[PDB]
Amino acid sequence: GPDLQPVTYSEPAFWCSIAYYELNQRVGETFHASQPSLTVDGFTDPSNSERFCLGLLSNVNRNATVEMTRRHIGRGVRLYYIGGEVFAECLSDSAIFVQSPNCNQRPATVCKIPPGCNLKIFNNQEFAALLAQSVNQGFEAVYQLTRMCTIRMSFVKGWGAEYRRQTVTSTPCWIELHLNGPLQWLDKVLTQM
Protein backbone atom coordinates (compact mmCIF):
# COMPACT_ATOMS: atom_id res chain seq x y z
CA GLY A 1 0.00 0.00 0.00
CA PRO A 2 2.08 2.93 -1.27
CA ASP A 3 -1.09 4.88 -2.17
CA LEU A 4 -3.07 6.99 0.28
CA GLN A 5 -6.69 6.62 1.34
CA PRO A 6 -9.24 7.58 -1.34
CA VAL A 7 -10.50 11.01 -0.30
CA THR A 8 -14.28 11.48 -0.25
CA TYR A 9 -16.43 14.49 0.60
CA SER A 10 -19.80 14.50 2.34
CA GLU A 11 -21.83 17.69 2.66
CA PRO A 12 -21.45 19.26 6.14
CA ALA A 13 -24.50 18.91 8.36
CA PHE A 14 -23.60 22.35 9.75
CA TRP A 15 -22.58 25.35 7.67
CA CYS A 16 -20.55 26.87 10.52
CA SER A 17 -19.19 26.27 14.00
CA ILE A 18 -18.84 28.96 16.67
CA ALA A 19 -16.51 28.92 19.69
CA TYR A 20 -16.94 31.37 22.57
CA TYR A 21 -14.00 32.95 24.41
CA GLU A 22 -13.47 35.16 27.46
CA LEU A 23 -10.13 36.94 27.16
CA ASN A 24 -7.86 34.05 26.10
CA GLN A 25 -9.81 31.08 27.54
CA ARG A 26 -12.37 28.91 25.79
CA VAL A 27 -15.72 29.03 27.57
CA GLY A 28 -18.46 26.49 26.91
CA GLU A 29 -19.02 24.00 24.13
CA THR A 30 -18.62 24.69 20.43
CA PHE A 31 -21.92 25.63 18.77
CA HIS A 32 -22.86 24.07 15.43
CA ALA A 33 -25.44 25.70 13.14
CA SER A 34 -27.79 23.42 11.20
CA GLN A 35 -30.09 26.27 10.10
CA PRO A 36 -29.41 29.09 7.60
CA SER A 37 -30.04 31.73 10.30
CA LEU A 38 -28.85 31.88 13.91
CA THR A 39 -28.33 34.38 16.72
CA VAL A 40 -25.55 34.49 19.31
CA ASP A 41 -26.92 36.35 22.34
CA GLY A 42 -26.33 36.75 26.06
CA PHE A 43 -29.42 34.87 27.22
CA THR A 44 -29.91 31.40 28.69
CA ASP A 45 -31.66 29.00 26.29
CA PRO A 46 -29.50 25.84 26.00
CA SER A 47 -31.77 23.96 23.57
CA ASN A 48 -32.46 26.09 20.47
CA SER A 49 -30.73 25.05 17.24
CA GLU A 50 -30.99 28.69 16.06
CA ARG A 51 -29.63 30.33 19.24
CA PHE A 52 -26.15 30.22 20.78
CA CYS A 53 -26.95 31.55 24.26
CA LEU A 54 -23.84 32.80 26.07
CA GLY A 55 -25.52 33.86 29.32
CA LEU A 56 -25.80 30.29 30.61
CA LEU A 57 -22.13 29.47 30.03
CA SER A 58 -20.17 29.56 33.28
CA ASN A 59 -16.53 30.48 33.86
CA VAL A 60 -15.12 30.15 37.37
CA ASN A 61 -12.05 32.23 36.40
CA ARG A 62 -14.19 35.20 35.27
CA ASN A 63 -13.53 38.74 36.50
CA ALA A 64 -16.02 41.58 36.94
CA THR A 65 -15.08 43.25 33.64
CA VAL A 66 -16.13 40.13 31.73
CA GLU A 67 -19.20 39.75 33.95
CA MET A 68 -20.30 43.32 33.20
CA THR A 69 -19.73 42.94 29.45
CA ARG A 70 -21.78 39.73 29.36
CA ARG A 71 -24.81 41.63 30.71
CA HIS A 72 -24.60 44.01 27.73
CA ILE A 73 -24.58 41.37 24.97
CA GLY A 74 -28.37 41.23 25.18
CA ARG A 75 -29.87 40.23 21.83
CA GLY A 76 -26.34 39.79 20.46
CA VAL A 77 -25.66 39.21 16.76
CA ARG A 78 -27.71 37.52 14.04
CA LEU A 79 -25.58 35.38 11.69
CA TYR A 80 -27.06 34.12 8.43
CA TYR A 81 -26.00 33.55 4.83
CA ILE A 82 -27.59 34.14 1.43
CA GLY A 83 -26.06 32.17 -1.43
CA GLY A 84 -22.29 32.21 -1.08
CA GLU A 85 -22.06 35.22 1.22
CA VAL A 86 -22.24 35.44 5.01
CA PHE A 87 -23.28 38.48 7.00
CA ALA A 88 -23.86 39.68 10.57
CA GLU A 89 -26.59 41.87 12.08
CA CYS A 90 -26.24 43.68 15.42
CA LEU A 91 -29.40 43.05 17.45
CA SER A 92 -27.73 44.14 20.70
CA ASP A 93 -27.93 47.51 22.42
CA SER A 94 -24.13 47.71 22.15
CA ALA A 95 -22.02 47.51 19.01
CA ILE A 96 -20.08 44.48 17.79
CA PHE A 97 -16.63 44.33 16.22
CA VAL A 98 -15.44 42.00 13.44
CA GLN A 99 -12.01 40.84 12.22
CA SER A 100 -12.35 39.10 8.85
CA PRO A 101 -9.13 38.45 6.87
CA ASN A 102 -11.30 37.72 3.81
CA CYS A 103 -12.72 41.23 4.21
CA ASN A 104 -9.29 42.71 4.97
CA GLN A 105 -7.87 41.09 1.83
CA ARG A 106 -10.42 43.20 -0.05
CA PRO A 107 -5.03 42.28 7.80
CA ALA A 108 -6.42 42.92 11.27
CA THR A 109 -9.01 45.61 10.40
CA VAL A 110 -11.83 45.58 12.96
CA CYS A 111 -15.17 47.01 11.80
CA LYS A 112 -17.96 48.27 14.03
CA ILE A 113 -21.57 47.23 13.53
CA PRO A 114 -23.77 49.75 15.38
CA PRO A 115 -26.98 48.51 17.04
CA GLY A 116 -29.46 47.70 14.29
CA CYS A 117 -27.03 47.52 11.38
CA ASN A 118 -26.84 44.67 8.85
CA LEU A 119 -23.32 44.01 7.53
CA LYS A 120 -21.70 41.40 5.29
CA ILE A 121 -18.63 39.55 6.55
CA PHE A 122 -17.77 36.92 3.92
CA ASN A 123 -17.81 36.43 0.13
CA ASN A 124 -17.05 32.91 -1.08
CA GLN A 125 -16.33 34.04 -4.65
CA GLU A 126 -13.50 36.32 -3.50
CA PHE A 127 -12.13 33.48 -1.37
CA ALA A 128 -12.08 31.07 -4.31
CA ALA A 129 -10.35 33.72 -6.42
CA LEU A 130 -7.73 34.19 -3.69
CA LEU A 131 -7.47 30.41 -3.27
CA ALA A 132 -6.87 30.22 -7.03
CA GLN A 133 -4.31 33.03 -6.77
CA SER A 134 -2.61 31.28 -3.83
CA VAL A 135 -1.91 27.87 -5.39
CA ASN A 136 0.93 29.51 -7.33
CA GLN A 137 2.41 30.85 -4.07
CA GLY A 138 3.29 27.46 -2.58
CA PHE A 139 2.00 24.95 -0.06
CA GLU A 140 2.60 27.10 3.02
CA ALA A 141 0.81 30.04 1.39
CA VAL A 142 -2.35 28.02 0.71
CA TYR A 143 -2.13 26.30 4.10
CA GLN A 144 -2.50 29.66 5.86
CA LEU A 145 -5.71 30.41 3.92
CA THR A 146 -7.64 28.97 6.88
CA ARG A 147 -7.56 32.51 8.27
CA MET A 148 -9.90 33.53 5.44
CA CYS A 149 -12.49 30.91 6.45
CA THR A 150 -12.53 32.08 10.09
CA ILE A 151 -14.19 35.25 11.42
CA ARG A 152 -13.69 36.66 14.92
CA MET A 153 -16.23 38.99 16.52
CA SER A 154 -16.24 40.85 19.84
CA PHE A 155 -19.24 42.14 21.80
CA VAL A 156 -19.41 45.66 23.29
CA LYS A 157 -15.63 46.15 23.40
CA GLY A 158 -13.40 46.64 20.38
CA TRP A 159 -9.76 45.82 19.74
CA GLY A 160 -6.98 46.53 17.27
CA ALA A 161 -5.06 49.59 16.18
CA GLU A 162 -7.77 52.06 17.24
CA TYR A 163 -8.09 50.70 20.79
CA ARG A 164 -6.18 50.15 24.02
CA ARG A 165 -6.89 46.42 23.71
CA GLN A 166 -4.27 45.41 21.15
CA THR A 167 -5.36 41.79 20.56
CA VAL A 168 -8.61 39.85 20.62
CA THR A 169 -7.32 37.92 23.65
CA SER A 170 -7.78 41.18 25.59
CA THR A 171 -11.50 41.50 24.81
CA PRO A 172 -13.85 40.15 27.51
CA CYS A 173 -16.34 38.41 25.17
CA TRP A 174 -15.63 37.21 21.64
CA ILE A 175 -16.48 34.35 19.28
CA GLU A 176 -14.70 32.56 16.45
CA LEU A 177 -16.73 31.49 13.40
CA HIS A 178 -15.57 28.66 11.12
CA LEU A 179 -17.07 28.32 7.62
CA ASN A 180 -17.22 24.58 6.95
CA GLY A 181 -18.08 24.71 3.24
CA PRO A 182 -15.09 26.83 2.22
CA LEU A 183 -12.89 24.79 4.57
CA GLN A 184 -13.78 21.68 2.57
CA TRP A 185 -12.83 23.34 -0.73
CA LEU A 186 -9.56 24.45 0.86
CA ASP A 187 -9.08 20.85 2.01
CA LYS A 188 -9.38 19.55 -1.56
CA VAL A 189 -6.78 22.01 -2.85
CA LEU A 190 -4.41 21.24 0.04
CA THR A 191 -4.56 17.51 -0.73
CA GLN A 192 -3.57 18.34 -4.33
CA MET A 193 -0.61 20.66 -3.65
Binding site: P12, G83, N124, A128, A129, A132, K188, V189, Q192, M193
Partner: peptide
Protein backbone atom coordinates in the same frame (compact mmCIF):
# COMPACT_ATOMS: atom_id res chain seq x y z
CA UNK B 1 -4.35 19.02 -13.96
CA UNK B 2 -6.88 17.96 -11.34
CA UNK B 3 -5.97 21.03 -9.28
CA UNK B 4 -7.07 23.40 -12.04
CA UNK B 5 -10.31 21.42 -12.24
CA UNK B 6 -10.98 21.87 -8.52
CA UNK B 7 -10.21 25.58 -8.82
CA UNK B 8 -12.70 25.85 -11.69
CA UNK B 9 -15.39 23.90 -9.81
CA UNK B 10 -14.91 26.12 -6.76
CA UNK B 11 -14.89 29.25 -8.94
CA UNK B 12 -18.26 28.09 -10.27
CA UNK B 13 -19.87 26.94 -7.01
CA UNK B 14 -18.62 30.03 -5.14
CA UNK B 15 -20.96 32.27 -7.12
CA UNK B 16 -24.17 31.06 -5.46
CA UNK B 17 -23.45 28.65 -2.59
CA UNK B 18 -21.38 27.88 0.49
CA UNK B 19 -21.57 24.19 -0.39
CA UNK B 20 -18.53 21.96 -0.34
CA UNK B 21 -17.19 19.73 -3.13
CA UNK B 22 -19.94 17.13 -2.65
Amino acid sequence: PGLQKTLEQFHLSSMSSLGGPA
